[PDB]
Tab-separated table of C-alpha atoms in Angstrom:
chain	number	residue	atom	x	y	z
A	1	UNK	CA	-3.091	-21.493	10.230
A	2	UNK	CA	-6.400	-22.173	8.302
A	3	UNK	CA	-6.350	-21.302	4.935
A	4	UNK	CA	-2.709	-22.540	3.848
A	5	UNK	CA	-3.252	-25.557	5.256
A	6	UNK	CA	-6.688	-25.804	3.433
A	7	UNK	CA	-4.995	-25.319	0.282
A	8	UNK	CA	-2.737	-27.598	1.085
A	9	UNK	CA	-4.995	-30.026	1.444
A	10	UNK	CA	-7.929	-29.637	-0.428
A	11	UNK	CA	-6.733	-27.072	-3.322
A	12	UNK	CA	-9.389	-24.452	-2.421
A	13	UNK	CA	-9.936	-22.312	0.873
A	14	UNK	CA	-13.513	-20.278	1.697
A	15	UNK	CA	-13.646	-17.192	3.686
A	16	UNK	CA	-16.876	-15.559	4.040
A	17	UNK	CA	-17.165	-12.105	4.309
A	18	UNK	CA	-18.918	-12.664	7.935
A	19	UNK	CA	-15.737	-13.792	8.951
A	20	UNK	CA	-13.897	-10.719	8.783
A	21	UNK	CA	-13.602	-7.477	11.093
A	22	UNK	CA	-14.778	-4.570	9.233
A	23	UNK	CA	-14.287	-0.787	10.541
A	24	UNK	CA	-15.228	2.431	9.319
A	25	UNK	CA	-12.569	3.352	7.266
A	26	UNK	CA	-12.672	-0.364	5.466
A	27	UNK	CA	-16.155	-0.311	5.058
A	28	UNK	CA	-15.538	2.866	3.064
A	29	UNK	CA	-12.725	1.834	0.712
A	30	UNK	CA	-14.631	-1.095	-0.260
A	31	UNK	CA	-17.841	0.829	-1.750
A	32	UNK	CA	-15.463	2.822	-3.254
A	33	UNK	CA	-13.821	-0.442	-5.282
A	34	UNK	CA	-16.691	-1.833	-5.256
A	35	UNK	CA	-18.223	1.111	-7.373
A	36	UNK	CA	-15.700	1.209	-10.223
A	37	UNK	CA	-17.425	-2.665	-11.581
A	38	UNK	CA	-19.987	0.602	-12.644
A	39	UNK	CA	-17.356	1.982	-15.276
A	40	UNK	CA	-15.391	-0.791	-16.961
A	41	UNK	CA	-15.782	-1.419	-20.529
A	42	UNK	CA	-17.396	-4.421	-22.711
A	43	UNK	CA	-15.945	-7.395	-24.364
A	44	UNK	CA	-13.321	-9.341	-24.575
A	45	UNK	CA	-26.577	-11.869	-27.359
A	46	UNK	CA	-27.691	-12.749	-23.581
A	47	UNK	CA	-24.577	-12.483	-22.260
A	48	UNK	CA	-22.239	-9.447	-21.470
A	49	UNK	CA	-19.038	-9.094	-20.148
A	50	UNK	CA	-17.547	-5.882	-19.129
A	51	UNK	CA	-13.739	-5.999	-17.446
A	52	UNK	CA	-10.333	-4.152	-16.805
A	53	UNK	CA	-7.004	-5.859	-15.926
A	54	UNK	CA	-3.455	-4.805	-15.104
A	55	UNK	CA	-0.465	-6.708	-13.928
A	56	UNK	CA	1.651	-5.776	-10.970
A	57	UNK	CA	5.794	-6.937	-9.985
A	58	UNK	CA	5.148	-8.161	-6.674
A	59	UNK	CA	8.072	-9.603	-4.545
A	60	UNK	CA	6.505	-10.782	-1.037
A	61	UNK	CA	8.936	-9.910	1.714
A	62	UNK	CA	9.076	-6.281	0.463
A	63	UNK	CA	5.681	-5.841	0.060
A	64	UNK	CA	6.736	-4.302	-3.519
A	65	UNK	CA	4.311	-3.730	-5.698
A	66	UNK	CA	4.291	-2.073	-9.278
A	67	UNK	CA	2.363	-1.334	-11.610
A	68	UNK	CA	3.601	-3.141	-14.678
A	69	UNK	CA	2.875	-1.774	-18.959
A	70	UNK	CA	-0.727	-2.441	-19.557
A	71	UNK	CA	-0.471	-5.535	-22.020
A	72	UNK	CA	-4.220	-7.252	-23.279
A	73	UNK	CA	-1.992	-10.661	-24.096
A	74	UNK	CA	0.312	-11.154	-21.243
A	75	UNK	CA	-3.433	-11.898	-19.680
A	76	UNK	CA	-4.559	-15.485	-18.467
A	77	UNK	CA	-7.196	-15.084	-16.073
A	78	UNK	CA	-11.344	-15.524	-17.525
A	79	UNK	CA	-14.749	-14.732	-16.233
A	80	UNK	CA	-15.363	-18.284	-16.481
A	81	UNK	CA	-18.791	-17.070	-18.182
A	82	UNK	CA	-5.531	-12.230	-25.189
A	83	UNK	CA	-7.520	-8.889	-26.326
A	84	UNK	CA	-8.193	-5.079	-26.436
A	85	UNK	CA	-6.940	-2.316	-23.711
A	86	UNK	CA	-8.719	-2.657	-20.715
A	87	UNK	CA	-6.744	-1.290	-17.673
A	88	UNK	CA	-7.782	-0.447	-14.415
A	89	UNK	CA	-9.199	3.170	-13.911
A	90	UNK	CA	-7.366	5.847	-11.966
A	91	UNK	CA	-9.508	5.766	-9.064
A	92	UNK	CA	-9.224	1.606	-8.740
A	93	UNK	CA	-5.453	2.130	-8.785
A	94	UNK	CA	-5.438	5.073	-6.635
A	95	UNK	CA	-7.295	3.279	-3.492
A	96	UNK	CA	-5.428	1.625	-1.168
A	97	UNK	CA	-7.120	-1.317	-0.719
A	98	UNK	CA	-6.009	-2.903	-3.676
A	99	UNK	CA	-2.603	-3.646	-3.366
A	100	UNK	CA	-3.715	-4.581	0.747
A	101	UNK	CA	-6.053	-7.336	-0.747
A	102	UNK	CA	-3.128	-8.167	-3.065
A	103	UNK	CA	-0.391	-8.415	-0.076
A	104	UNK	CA	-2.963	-9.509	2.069
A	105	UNK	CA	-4.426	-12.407	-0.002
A	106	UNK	CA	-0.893	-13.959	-0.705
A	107	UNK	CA	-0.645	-14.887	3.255
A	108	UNK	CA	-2.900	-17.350	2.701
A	109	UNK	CA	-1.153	-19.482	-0.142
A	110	UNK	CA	1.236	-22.266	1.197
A	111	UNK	CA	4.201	-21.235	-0.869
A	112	UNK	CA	6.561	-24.471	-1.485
A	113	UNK	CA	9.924	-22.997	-0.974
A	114	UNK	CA	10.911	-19.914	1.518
A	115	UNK	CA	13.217	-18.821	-0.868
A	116	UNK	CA	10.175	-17.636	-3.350
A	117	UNK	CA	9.449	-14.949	-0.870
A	118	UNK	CA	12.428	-12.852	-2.036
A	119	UNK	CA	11.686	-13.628	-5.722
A	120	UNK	CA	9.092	-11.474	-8.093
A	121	UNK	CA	5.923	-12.592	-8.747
A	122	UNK	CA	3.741	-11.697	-11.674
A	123	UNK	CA	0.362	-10.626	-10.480
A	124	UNK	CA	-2.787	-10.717	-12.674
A	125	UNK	CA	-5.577	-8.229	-11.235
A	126	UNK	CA	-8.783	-8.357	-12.852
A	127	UNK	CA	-12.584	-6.862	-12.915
A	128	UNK	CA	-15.099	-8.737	-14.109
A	129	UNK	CA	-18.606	-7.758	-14.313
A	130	UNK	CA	-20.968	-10.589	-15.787
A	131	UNK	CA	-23.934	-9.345	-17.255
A	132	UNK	CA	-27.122	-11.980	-17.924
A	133	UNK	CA	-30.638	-10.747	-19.290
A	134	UNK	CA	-33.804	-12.186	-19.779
A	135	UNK	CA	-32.841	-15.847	-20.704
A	136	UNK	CA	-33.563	-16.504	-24.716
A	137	UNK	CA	-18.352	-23.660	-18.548
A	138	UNK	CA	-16.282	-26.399	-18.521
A	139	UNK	CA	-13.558	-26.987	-15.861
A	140	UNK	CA	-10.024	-25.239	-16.564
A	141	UNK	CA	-7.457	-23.764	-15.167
A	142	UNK	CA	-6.186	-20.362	-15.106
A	143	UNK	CA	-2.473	-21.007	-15.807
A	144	UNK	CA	-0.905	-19.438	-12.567
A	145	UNK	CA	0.097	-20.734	-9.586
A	146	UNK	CA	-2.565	-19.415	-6.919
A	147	UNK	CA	-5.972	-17.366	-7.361
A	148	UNK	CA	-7.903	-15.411	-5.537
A	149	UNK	CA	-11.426	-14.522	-6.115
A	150	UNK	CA	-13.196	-11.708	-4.409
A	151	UNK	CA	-17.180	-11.331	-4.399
A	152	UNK	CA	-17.445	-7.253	-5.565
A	153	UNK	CA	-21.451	-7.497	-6.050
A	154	UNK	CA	-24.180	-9.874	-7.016
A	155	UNK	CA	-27.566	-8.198	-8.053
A	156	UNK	CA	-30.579	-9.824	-9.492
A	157	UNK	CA	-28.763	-12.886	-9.701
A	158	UNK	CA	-29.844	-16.922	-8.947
A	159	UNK	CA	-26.928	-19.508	-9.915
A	160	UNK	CA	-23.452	-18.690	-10.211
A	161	UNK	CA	-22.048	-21.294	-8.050
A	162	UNK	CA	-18.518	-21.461	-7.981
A	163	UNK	CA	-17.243	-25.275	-8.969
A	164	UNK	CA	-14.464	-26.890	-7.643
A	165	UNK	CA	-12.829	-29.615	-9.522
A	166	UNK	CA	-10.427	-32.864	-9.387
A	167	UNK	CA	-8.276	-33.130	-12.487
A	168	UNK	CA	-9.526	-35.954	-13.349
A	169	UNK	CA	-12.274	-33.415	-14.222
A	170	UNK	CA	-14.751	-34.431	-11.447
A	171	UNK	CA	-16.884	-32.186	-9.225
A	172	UNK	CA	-15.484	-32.372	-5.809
A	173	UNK	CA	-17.393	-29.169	-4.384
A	174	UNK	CA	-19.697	-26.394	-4.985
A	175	UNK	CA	-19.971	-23.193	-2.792
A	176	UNK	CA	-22.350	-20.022	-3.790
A	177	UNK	CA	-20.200	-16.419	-3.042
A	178	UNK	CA	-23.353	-14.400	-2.197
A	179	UNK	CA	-22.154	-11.568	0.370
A	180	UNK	CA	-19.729	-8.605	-0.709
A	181	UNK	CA	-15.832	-9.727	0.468
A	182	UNK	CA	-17.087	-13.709	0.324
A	183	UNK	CA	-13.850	-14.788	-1.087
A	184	UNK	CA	-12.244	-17.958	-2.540
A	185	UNK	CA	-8.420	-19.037	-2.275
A	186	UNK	CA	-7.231	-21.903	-4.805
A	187	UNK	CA	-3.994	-23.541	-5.783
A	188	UNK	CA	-4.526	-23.262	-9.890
A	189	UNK	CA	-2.228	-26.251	-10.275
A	190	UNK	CA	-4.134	-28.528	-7.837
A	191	UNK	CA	-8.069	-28.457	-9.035
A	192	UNK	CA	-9.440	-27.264	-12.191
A	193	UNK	CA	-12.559	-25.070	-11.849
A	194	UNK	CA	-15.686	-22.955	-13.047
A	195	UNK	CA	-18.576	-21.019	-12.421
A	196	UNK	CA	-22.212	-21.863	-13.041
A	197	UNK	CA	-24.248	-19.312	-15.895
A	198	UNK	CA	-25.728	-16.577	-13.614
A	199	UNK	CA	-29.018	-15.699	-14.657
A	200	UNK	CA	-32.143	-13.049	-13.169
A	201	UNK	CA	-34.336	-13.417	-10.545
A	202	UNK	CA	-36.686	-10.718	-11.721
A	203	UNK	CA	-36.981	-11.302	-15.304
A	204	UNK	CA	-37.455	-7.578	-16.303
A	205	UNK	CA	-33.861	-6.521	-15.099
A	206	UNK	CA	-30.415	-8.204	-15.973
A	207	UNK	CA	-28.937	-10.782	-13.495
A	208	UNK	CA	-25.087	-9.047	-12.572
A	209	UNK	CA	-21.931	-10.686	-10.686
A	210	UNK	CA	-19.195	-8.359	-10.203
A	211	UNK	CA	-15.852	-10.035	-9.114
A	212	UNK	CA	-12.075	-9.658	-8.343
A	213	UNK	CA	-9.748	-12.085	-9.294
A	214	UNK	CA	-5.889	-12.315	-9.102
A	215	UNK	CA	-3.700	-14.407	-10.218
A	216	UNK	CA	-0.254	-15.312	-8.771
A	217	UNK	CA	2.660	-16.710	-10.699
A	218	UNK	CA	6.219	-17.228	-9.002
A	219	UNK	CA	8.357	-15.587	-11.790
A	220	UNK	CA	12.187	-15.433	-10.526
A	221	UNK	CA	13.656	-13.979	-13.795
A	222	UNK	CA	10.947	-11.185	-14.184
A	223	UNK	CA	12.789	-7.907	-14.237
A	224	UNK	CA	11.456	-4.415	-13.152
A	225	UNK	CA	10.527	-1.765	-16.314
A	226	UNK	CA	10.667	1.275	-16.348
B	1	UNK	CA	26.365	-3.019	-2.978
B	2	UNK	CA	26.617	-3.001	-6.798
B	3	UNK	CA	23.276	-4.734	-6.971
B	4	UNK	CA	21.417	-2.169	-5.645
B	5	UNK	CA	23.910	0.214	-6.922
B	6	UNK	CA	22.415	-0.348	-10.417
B	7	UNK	CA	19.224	-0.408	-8.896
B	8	UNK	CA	18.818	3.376	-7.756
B	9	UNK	CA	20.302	4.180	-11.204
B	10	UNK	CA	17.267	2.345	-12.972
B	11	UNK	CA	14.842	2.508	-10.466
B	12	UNK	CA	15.905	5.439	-7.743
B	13	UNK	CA	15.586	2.774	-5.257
B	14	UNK	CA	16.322	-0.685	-3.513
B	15	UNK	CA	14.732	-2.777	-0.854
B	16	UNK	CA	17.148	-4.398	1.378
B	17	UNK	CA	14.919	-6.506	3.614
B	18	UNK	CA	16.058	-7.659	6.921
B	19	UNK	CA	15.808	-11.084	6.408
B	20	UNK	CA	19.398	-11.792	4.632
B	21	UNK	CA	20.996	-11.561	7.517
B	22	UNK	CA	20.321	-9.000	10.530
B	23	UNK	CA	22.723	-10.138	13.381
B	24	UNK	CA	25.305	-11.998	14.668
B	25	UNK	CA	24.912	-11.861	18.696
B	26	UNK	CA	26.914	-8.527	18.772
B	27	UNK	CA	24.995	-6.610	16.217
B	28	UNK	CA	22.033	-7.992	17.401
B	29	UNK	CA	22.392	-6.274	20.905
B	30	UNK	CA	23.618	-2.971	19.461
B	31	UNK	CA	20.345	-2.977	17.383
B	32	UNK	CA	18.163	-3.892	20.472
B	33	UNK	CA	20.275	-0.669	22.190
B	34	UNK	CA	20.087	1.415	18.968
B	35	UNK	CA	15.673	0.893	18.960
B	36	UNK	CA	15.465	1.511	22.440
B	37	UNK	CA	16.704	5.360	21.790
B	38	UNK	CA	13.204	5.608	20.604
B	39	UNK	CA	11.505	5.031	23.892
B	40	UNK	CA	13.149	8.518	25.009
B	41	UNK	CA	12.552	10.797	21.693
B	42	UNK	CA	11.394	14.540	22.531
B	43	UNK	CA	7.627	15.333	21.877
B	44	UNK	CA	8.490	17.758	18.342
B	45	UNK	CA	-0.909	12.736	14.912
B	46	UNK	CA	1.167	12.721	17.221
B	47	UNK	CA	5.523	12.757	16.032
B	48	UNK	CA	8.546	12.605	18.153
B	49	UNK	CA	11.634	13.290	17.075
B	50	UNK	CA	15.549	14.006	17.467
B	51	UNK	CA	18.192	15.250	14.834
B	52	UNK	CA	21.714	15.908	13.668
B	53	UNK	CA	24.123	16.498	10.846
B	54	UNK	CA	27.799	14.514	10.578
B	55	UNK	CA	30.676	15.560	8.502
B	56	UNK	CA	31.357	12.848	6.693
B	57	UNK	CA	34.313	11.524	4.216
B	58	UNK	CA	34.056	8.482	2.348
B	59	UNK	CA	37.553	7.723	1.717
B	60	UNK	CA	38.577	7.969	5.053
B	61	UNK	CA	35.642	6.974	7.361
B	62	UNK	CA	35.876	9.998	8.949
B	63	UNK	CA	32.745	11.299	10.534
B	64	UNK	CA	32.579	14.147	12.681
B	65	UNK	CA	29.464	15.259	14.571
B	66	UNK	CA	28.676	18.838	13.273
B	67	UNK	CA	27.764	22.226	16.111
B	68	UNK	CA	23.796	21.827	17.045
B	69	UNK	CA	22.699	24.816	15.335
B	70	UNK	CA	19.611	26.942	17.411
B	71	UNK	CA	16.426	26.868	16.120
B	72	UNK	CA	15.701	30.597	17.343
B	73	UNK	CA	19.400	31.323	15.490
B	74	UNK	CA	18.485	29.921	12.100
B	75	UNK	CA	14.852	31.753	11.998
B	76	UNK	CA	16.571	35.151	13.404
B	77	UNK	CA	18.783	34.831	10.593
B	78	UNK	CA	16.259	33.215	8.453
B	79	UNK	CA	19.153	30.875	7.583
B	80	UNK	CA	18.555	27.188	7.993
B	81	UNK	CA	22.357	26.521	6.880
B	82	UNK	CA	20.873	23.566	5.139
B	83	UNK	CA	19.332	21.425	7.723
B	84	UNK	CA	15.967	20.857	8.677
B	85	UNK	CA	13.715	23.996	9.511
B	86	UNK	CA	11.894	22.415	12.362
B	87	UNK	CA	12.729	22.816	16.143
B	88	UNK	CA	14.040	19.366	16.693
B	89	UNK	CA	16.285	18.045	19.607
B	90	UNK	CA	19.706	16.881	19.195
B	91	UNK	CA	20.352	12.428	19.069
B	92	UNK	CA	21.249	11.279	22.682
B	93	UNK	CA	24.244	10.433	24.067
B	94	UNK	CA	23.218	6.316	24.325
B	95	UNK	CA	22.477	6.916	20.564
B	96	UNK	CA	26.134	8.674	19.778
B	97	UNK	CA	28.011	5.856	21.805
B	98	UNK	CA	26.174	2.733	19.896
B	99	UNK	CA	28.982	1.820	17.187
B	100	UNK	CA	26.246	0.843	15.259
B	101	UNK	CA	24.869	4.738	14.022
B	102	UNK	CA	28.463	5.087	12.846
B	103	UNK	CA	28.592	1.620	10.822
B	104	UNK	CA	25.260	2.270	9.587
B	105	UNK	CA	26.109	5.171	8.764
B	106	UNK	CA	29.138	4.252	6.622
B	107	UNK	CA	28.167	1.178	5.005
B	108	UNK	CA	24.667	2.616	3.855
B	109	UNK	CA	26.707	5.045	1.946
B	110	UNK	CA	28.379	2.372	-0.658
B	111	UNK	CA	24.821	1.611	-1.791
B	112	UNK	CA	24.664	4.859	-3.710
B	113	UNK	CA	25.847	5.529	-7.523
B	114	UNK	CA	28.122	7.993	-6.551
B	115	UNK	CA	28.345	10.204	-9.804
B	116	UNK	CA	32.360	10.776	-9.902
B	117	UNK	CA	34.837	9.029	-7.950
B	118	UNK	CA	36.874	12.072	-6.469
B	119	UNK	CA	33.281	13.042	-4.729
B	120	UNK	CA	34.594	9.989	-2.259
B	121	UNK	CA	37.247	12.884	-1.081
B	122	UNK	CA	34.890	15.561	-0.254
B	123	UNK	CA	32.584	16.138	2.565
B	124	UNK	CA	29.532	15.047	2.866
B	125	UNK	CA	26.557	16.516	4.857
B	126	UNK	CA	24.975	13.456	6.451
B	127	UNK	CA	21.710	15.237	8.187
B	128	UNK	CA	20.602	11.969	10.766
B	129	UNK	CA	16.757	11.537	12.139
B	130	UNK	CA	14.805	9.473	14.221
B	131	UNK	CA	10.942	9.591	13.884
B	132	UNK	CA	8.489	8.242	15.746
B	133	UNK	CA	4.892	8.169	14.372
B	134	UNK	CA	2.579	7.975	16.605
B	135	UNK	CA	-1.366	7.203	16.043
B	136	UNK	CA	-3.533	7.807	19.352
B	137	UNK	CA	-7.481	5.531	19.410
B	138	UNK	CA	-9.175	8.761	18.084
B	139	UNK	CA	-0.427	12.416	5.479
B	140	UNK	CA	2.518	14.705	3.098
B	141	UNK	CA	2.317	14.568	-0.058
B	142	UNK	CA	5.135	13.264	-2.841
B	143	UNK	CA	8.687	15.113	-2.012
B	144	UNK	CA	11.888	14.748	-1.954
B	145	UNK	CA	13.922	15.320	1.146
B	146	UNK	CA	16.874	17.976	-1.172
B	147	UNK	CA	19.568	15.755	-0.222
B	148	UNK	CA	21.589	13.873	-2.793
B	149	UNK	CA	20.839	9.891	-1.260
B	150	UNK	CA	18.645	9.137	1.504
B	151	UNK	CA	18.255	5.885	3.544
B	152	UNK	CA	15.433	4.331	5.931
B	153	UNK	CA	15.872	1.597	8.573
B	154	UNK	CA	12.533	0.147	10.555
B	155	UNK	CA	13.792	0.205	13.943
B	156	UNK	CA	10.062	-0.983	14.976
B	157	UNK	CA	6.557	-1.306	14.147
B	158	UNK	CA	3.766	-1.556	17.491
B	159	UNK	CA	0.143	-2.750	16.505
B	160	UNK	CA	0.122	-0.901	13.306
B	161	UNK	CA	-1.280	-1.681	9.773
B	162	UNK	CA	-0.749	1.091	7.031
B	163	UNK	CA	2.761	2.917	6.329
B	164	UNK	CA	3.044	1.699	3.069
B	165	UNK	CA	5.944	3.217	1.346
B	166	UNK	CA	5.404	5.320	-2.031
B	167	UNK	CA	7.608	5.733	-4.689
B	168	UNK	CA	6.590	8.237	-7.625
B	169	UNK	CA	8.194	9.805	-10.093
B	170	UNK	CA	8.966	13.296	-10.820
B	171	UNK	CA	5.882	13.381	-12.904
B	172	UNK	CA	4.420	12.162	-9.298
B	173	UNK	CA	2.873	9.409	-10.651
B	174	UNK	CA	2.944	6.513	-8.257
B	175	UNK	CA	5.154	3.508	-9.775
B	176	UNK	CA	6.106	1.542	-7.077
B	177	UNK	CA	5.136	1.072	-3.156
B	178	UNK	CA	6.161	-1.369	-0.111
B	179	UNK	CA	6.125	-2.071	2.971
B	180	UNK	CA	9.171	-1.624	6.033
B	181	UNK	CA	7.589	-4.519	8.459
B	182	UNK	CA	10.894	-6.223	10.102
B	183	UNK	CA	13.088	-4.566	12.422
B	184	UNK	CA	15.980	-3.461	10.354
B	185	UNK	CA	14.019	-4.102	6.890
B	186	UNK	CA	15.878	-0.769	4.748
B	187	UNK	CA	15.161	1.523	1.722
B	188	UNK	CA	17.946	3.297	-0.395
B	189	UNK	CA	17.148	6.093	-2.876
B	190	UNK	CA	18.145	8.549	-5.507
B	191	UNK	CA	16.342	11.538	-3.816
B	192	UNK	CA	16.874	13.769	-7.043
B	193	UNK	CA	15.836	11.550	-9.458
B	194	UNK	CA	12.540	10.337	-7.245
B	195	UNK	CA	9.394	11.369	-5.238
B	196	UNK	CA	8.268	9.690	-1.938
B	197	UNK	CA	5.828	9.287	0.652
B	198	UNK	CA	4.298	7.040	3.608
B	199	UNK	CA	0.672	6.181	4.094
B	200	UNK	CA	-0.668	7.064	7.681
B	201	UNK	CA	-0.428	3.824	10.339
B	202	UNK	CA	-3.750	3.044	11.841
B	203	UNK	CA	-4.281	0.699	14.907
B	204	UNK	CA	-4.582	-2.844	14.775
B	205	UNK	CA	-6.249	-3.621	18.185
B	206	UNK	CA	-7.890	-0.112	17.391
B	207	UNK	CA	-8.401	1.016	21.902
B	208	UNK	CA	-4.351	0.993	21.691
B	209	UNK	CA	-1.843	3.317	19.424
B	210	UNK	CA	0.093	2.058	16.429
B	211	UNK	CA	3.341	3.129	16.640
B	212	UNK	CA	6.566	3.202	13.931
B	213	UNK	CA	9.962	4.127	14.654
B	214	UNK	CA	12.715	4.702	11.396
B	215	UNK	CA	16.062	6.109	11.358
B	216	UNK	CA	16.501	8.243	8.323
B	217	UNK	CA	19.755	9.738	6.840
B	218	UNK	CA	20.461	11.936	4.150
B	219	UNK	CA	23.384	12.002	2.461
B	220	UNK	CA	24.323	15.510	0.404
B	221	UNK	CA	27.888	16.115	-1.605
B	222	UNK	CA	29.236	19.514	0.340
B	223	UNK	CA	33.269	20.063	-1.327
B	224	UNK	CA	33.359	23.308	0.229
B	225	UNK	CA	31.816	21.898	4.081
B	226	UNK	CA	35.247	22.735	6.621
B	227	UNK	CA	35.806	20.881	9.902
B	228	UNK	CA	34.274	22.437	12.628
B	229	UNK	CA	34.396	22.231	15.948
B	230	UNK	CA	33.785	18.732	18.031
């Protein structure tokens, strides 16, 4: 099917938001994780960065998922625009289409060996919101095995295109995530990427991207902790 | 068995998905038989439902199939002896006759942490459900089921998304959660020492129901429990 084969063979995978079926109830849970890119805090001059991250145990056949100790340096994944406590709010964790993106999301990566279903994974899970005002990079990887990048929000914004890479460090593609649920698959081992500076359309108001992005590393000796 | 032994004493549970190994031919066809038994479930969303309790001793194998005990009898007496306090119909005889619900039954058991080894001598109280959920084109909370161990098979799963399992812990906050989607994919847990709960199904073609059938048994230590009557 589509995607895996996609990443198979081009390291990357698009899937537009128009593309998906969308009830009621859905529709619903994604304002509501949408809305939380409202109340994350700043950090780690033009340029802002607000975020939370947590890491989930993840072993695919199962479906299990936990919640694993909030720790700033066990973190890999960038805003492509190591640190303080960040994690994600009660209300983020509480909605249950989090860890459905997160089981959902994995279908699409063309895992190498059948036997890494039944083996834990380390999951990064990350908010980003990217904050530009009035206007006064490079390709990289993300050090996991497969990513996942979900378009949250994008207001005031012109640029931002998302850059896909050779290793060689030459620009194979560039695609523009513009609609809420436009989301990206990519095999972090196969292309090295990044995102172009966002920056406002209106030049009294900031230019904001708010994204999703996990991270996926096969880790057969991670144990659970209690 | 000692794997996931050690695993309800860390963690109060342990995933056994079906994949390493469901069935030779013969087991196969007794769990085709076995899933079948919940095409014919009493109407008790929408949840059907049928119940019982076995005797049960580990050392032997012995299980016995305890006295159905009237619903109007228990609430007269406001006495539940134990057992559920729902009006629930008894398991049917294709289910009974299925060797399967007895080796199920049996070799669930010696995925528990049994605390002390003479318990294997005693009765146990071994209270046996099938469920079938039922969501029609139109949740509890954390508990624990008061039963020393409890198991879950998925017998089936019929256009439905949702029923995540939930694991919490007595402080009920949520630490771990999965998903039963093989026939035969199992759960084992430490009910005293966890909290649990499922997430409603929904419809995946959303003009036809979802529907999920599990067995469930729960397993409580009973030294004093006599014989009765088969």
């Amino acid at each position: 099917t589509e995607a895996r084969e996609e990443l198979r063979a081009n390291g990357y995978s698009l899937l537009p938001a128009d593309r998906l079926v969308i009830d009621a109830e859905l529709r619903q849970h994604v304002k509501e994780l949408a809305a939380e890119w409202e109340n994350l805090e700043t950090d780690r001059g033009s340029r802002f960065r607000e975020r939370a991250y947590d890491r989930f145990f993840f072993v695919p056949r199962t479906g299990e998922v936990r919640l694993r100790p909030h720790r700033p340096y066990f973190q890999s994944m960038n805003a492509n625009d190591d640190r303080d406590v960040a994690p994600l709010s009660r209300t983020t964790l509480a909605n249950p289409l989090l860890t459905r993106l997160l089981r959902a999301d994995f279908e699409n990566f063309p895992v190498p060996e059948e036997s890494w279903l039944d083996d834990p994974w380390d999951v990064q899970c990350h908010q980003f919101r990217i904050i530009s005002t009035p206007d006064e990079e490079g390709p990289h990887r993300d050090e996991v095995d497969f990513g996942v990048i979900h378009l949250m929000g994008r207001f005031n914004a012109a640029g931002g295109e998302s850059q896909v890479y050779s290793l060689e460090r030459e620009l194979v593609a560039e695609f523009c995530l513009t609609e809420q649920m436009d989301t990206m698959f990519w095999s972090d081992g196969q292309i090295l990427h990044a995102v172009r500076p966002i920056h406002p359309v209106d030049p009294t108001k900031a230019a904001v991207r708010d994204v999703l992005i996990m991270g996926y590393k096969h880790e057969p000796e991670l144990r659970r902790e209690e």
